[PDB]
Amino acid sequence: ADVIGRRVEVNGEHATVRFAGVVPPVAGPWLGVEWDNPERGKHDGSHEGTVYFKCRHPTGGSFIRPNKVNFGTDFLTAIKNR
Numbered sequence: 001a002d003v004i005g006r007r008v009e010v011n012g013e014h015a016t017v018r019f020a021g022v023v024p025p026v027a028g029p030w031l032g033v034e035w036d037n038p039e040r041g042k043h044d045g046s047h048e049g050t051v052y053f054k055c056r057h058p059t060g061g062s063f064i065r066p067n068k069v070n071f072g073t074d075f076l077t078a079i080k081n082r
Contacts, residue, residue, distance in 0.1 A: 001033070008069045013037060018045070018053035023063050030063045 003020050010033065019032035025048065032053050035041050038060035045053045045061040055061045071079075 006071060008033065008071055010064060010069060013040065017069075018055070021052070023047065023052060024050065029066050031069055032061060032063050033064060033069070034061050037050070 001020075003017055004028055005017070005038075007014060007016055009015075015033040017031055018031040018034055020063055022028075022034070023030040027033075031057050032045065033060070034055050040062075041057065041060040044058045045051065045055050053061070
C-alpha cells in the first residue's frame with residue numbers, strides 16, 4: 001500500500017506506481033506504472049474490464065514485474081557512485 005505514489009525508472013524513463021497486486025489473466029505479482037511519455041504506454045490502466053487504476057491519458061499505463069522496477073538510491077550513495 002505504501003509503494004503507491006513512488007517514482008521509479010525503467011528503460012531510462014520515469015514512471016509512477018499506481019497499483020500493486022494481481023492483474024489477471026496473467027497470474028503472478030504485478031506493479032502498474034504510468035509512463036510520462038504516453039507514446040510508450042498501451043492502455044489507460046484497466047484490462048478486460050477490471051479497472052485497477054486510472055490515468056490522465058487513454059494510452060499511458062502498463063504492468064511491470066517487481067524485479068523489473070528500480071526505485072533508485074538516495075543523495076549520499078549517488079554522490080559516492082558519481
